[PDB]
Amino acid sequence: SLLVKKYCKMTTEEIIRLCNDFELPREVAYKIVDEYNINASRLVCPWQLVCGLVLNCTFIVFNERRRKDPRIDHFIVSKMCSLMLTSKVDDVIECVKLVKELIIGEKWFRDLQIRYDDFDGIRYDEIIFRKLGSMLQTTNILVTDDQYNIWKKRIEM
Amino acid sequence: CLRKRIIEEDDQFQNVAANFIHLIVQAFHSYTGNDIFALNDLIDFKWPKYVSRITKENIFEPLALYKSAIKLFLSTDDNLDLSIISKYLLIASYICSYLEPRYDASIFSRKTRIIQGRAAYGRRKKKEVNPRYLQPSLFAIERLLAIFQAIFPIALREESLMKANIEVFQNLSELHTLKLIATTMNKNIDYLSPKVRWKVNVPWEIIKEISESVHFNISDYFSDIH
Amino acid sequence: ADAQRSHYTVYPSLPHIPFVKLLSGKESEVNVEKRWELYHQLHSHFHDQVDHIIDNIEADLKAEISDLLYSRCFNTIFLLGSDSTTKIELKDESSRYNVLIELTPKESPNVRMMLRRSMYKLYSAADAEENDVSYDLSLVENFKRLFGKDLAMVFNFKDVDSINFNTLDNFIILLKSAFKYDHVKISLIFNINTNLSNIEKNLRQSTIRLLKRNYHKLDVSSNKGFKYGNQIFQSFLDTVDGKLNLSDRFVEFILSKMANNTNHNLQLLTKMLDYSLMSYFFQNAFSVFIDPVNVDFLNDDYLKILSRCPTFMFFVEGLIKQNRGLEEFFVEFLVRENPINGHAKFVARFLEEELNITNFNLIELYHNLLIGKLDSYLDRWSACKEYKDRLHFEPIDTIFQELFTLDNRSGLLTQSIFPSYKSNIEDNLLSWEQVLPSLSGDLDKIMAPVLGQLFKLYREANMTINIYDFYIAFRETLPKEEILNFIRKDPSNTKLLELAETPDAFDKVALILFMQAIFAFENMGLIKFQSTKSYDLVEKCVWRGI
Amino acid sequence: SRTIKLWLKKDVKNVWENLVQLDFFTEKSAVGLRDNATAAFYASNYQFQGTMIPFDLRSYQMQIILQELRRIIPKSNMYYSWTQL
Amino acid sequence: SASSFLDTFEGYFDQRKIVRTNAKSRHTMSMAPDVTREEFSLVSNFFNENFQKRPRQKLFEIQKKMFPQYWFELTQGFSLLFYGVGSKRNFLEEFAIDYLSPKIAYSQLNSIPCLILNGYNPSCNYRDVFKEITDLLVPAELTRSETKYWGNHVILQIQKMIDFYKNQPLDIKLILVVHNLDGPSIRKNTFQTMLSFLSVIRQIAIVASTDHIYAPLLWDNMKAQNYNFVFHDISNFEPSTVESTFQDVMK
């Protein structure tokens, strides 16, 4: 496993290669890199921070494709369990929920969540009614309209 | 009871009652002292249970009657539904009252450190006197909520630790209402004042029985400190 | 000004149901009206049964208290788990007068007030049935001379776990002196909410030995043996039988919330059941089809919504593996009984009457019948082994049954009745873009609201904070040129322009915005000033998620 | 170690209450009987902190010290050696 | 903070470390700029009326669509408790005056009278509040038997009101708007007992607000049962200009 390794010498190009393995554009990848540099030391296992940062941005950037296909989540989790050479899927979840606590308040994470409309996996137009306690909020009980149209196309083909 | 027992199985009855009184005195004089009222109460509590052990073999043998009713003369026998959140809040308040807050990170901290940080070393020397013999110390609300969160029973979107919602605070308010926890002020209490500090108000046997009702090992938390 | 008064009454000038139009506002108003009327029939049919159950609770409590009360010492009764809200009535039996004296810890600051209030109550009742007196125990001594009747006093100590036990011990020892008067008998009722052992160690051992001479225990909690909550749950089952169904998540949430409340979980159970019924009749446009008269009012919007049903999804996917017709199918396939409630009632009356299994909760029985584990619930008693094949039931996963269901997936029940209040406050403080929309446009995007920035700097600081250093840390994040451009964008206000002309303008603006947020944080309870006349350091009182 | 029944803690409570009632122990810093009825009435409307805590944590002080106990307990008494320190 | 954890009990224990004496800064307000009361007020109202006013107005327009749900909760006997970050004063006045009283008055056929308590005022007193409640509702006076023996006449009067109004038709006669139910004089136990016992009555609508993070510590099982709250988070980051003038700000 790469999450047990302590005090590793990370070049600046390995993080860009790991970000390009998850199709992150240049701004978010450079922000992950800069987030690594300002906490370069004070670090125990760099791979845990980089892995949590990359997957935390991955669920934000690709949140449109994660609502349509729930398999994408397992798929990306497994690519990660791989690039970290680990067979335990709870270590990756521990990594992302430990990195989320260090990134939940910054300005750039705020800009990313605003621009891709992520807000812990929710649109703003739903989360304002979850926070208000609306009776008329959208319930995850009925199928999505576009998902139902996609299924109707799948049975038409 | 004696008059129904003698038909179910005067001077002899007088000797039976007098021998019972003398046995009661010799069993419980150290417990009662020279107290007529307490010994009268013990005689009233133990006379029918002594009469029920009287058989045809036991009347003329006071020794055989004494061994027939030995358990009456060995112990005094003068005696007469809380929520899970309330029980764990009482346990956490007992811990907060009887453990110093400088060492809490050396008992409860279990998280993985992304950031380089040194946990607490722990206490060096044991105490000489058991601190549960003394009066409890006072604590703040957030310390009690910290220890309650650390000791309460339990993935990408779960966050399995229980946070302090309104049911926890309602249980804490009821616990103050029942005087199982107490404050520095007794009347006209500003609950929301930061100056107001809280202490446990139960003895160790009560918190022991409470911890035995929820299978929590509270004696493990005080074994290493004195 | 009305904003500066303590209180004021407003009679506002004025110039029809709270239900709104569903279906994206394409619902008709008459369907809104019959939604309202159907909600009221269900609510009334539930609450009439609930009121009858509550009256039965107080009736059997009165009967058990009177039976334990009337069938040279005290007659002591310990009501364990009592909220002290029971109205005790004594009998009317001739040649003797029976007085109930109720005493509260507020009415008991010392023994003298206890005796004075008790004797005033005694003399008031004895005068009210058929010359002034001294309100002490000699009135108990002279009661047969002054009234011609024997005396039976019943003392009801309300909320014993709040009283001073030294005062109560001295009052009981004082009441012991009335035993020699030959016409007086005294009953004591203690409403205990913790445990008998707690009140044992708070009293003297001689007082315990006095109370032990004649005492009984009577346990009446809100769910003593689950018998009264089972009636409320069964009446809710009957009011939605053949009409609505319960998910296992909702029953699981109900069991979890009733586990967290000790004395008042019956009203809590009724509260979440009524709030779920409210949420359904406010949310679902298909609730008009609860009544089988309204099925002819179908539309294209109704058929479009009901097509997105996972059970109907699996049904048509199985059909393709193996509108008018859809309308007839929807009409025909909502008729059936859904016999889970009848089977639950049958299992309940079979266990209660035949096997004499009485310490069961109907809610977990219904949960196990919902998840198909009624044998796994029944095999904990080792008495229905011969009837495991008799009471076997498996649910039928009927199609579009989630259009008529009470289910907890959105967390609306969690947000409304049991919110994570402190965590919601901290989450809104830390992540304010989930509160405020992302629409002086330049400043609103580049600089956060001051409370949120203050909480972000608050969270990452130590337990003790120097507020000058805290104010410098707050000042380094704010943009200087954009703030100075925003403050000069009001040309009508000349004092603002004059203050913006000063070279120390940004430090003053930062200090003003910092001090307003610091006093907001102090009022909310987040920070605590150390000394009264220093005001230089603060302590954090609040950490997020704990 | 060098046989007396060892009484349990639940039975020593009665002995402790008897010792308090016989004026051997006094509650710590207790005023006791007030000089006049006005101070006594003022004291009767206040709940003291000793009466709201459990009985095993109440602070007491002796009316008779160990040196006096050594002075008046006979030498033949079998608890005499513990009046020394 | 030189810490590894921020949130949860881990952050609580990790951020409360023994900082050394030499590490502590000695900075005070003597190195801070001096401001007057008037420029403080001027910058205060300018920022309150121009910084993020448009998102606050949009969000306030969003929360106004929940007013029929609030009215529906009030018709079933629940008391509304509004909490959040920012002032809820204008929200509670606008909901209870512009919306709730005319809707209730039209639904049971003058408008329903609204009594507004200001719990941010330290001089909010429960005896005068019950005097105006008595003036608005005209309850029957206690008899001599009901007065007990130096009993509290307010609480006994409300208990008489409770077992009187149990038989009346369920028509809302009074709206009780309590601003800052957690404020300095209202949070005391006698006032909370008074208001929870008034919340028992079906014919009084209770709309309340809280500001302290520890406000649910005020209510035990009896008080939470009598209050019968439905909670609503209406965080808006409102500046709280009215409530700030009841504390000494410039110190």
Numbering used by the authors:
A (entry chain F): 271 to 427
B (entry chain E): 214 to 222, 229 to 299, 323 to 396, 407 to 478
C (entry chain C): 16 to 30, 38 to 93, 100 to 158, 179 to 370, 385 to 501, 510 to 616
D (entry chain D): 424 to 425, 447 to 529
E (entry chain B): 235 to 343, 356 to 497
What do the authors of the reporting publication say about this deposited model?
Binding of the Origin Recognition Complex (ORC) to DNA initiates the ATP-dependent recruitment of Cdc6, Cdt1 and Mcm2-7 loading, but the structural details for timely ATPase site regulation and for how loading can be impeded by inhibitory signals, such as cyclin-dependent kinase phosphorylation, are unknown.
In our cryo-EM structure of the ternary complex, Cdc6 is seen to complete the ORC ring as expected by binding in between Orc1 and Orc2. Surprisingly, masked classification of the Cdc6 region revealed that the ORC·Cdc6 ring adopts two distinct conformations that differ in pitch and the positioning of Cdc6. Both states also differ from the ring conformation seen in a loading intermediate containing DNA, ORC, Cdc6, Cdt1, and Mcm2-7 (OCCM), indicating this change in ring conformation may be linked to the functional ORC·Cdc6 cycle during Mcm2-7 loading. One possibility is that Cdc6 binding drives ScORC into a hydrolysis-competent conformation; however, inspection of the Orc1·Orc4 ATPase site configuration in our 2.5 and 2.7 Å cryo-EM structures of ODC1 and ODC2 reveals that the active site waters remain in a non-lytic position. The second ATPase center in the ternary ScORC·DNA·Cdc6 complex at the interface between Orc1 and Cdc6 likewise appears to reside in a pre-hydrolysis state. Overall, the Cdc6·Orc1 sites in ODC1 and ODC2 are configured very similarly to each other and to that of Orc1 and Orc4, but the Cdc6-sensor 1 (N263), which is important for budding yeast viability and ATP hydrolysis by Cdc648,58,59, points into the active site and bonds with the γ-phosphate. A water molecule positioned for an in-line nucleophilic attack, however, is not seen. Intriguingly, Cdc6 binding to ScORC causes conformational rearrangements in the B-loop of Orc1 that help reorient the Orc1 arginine finger helix (with arginine finger R616) for completion of the Cdc6 ATPase site.
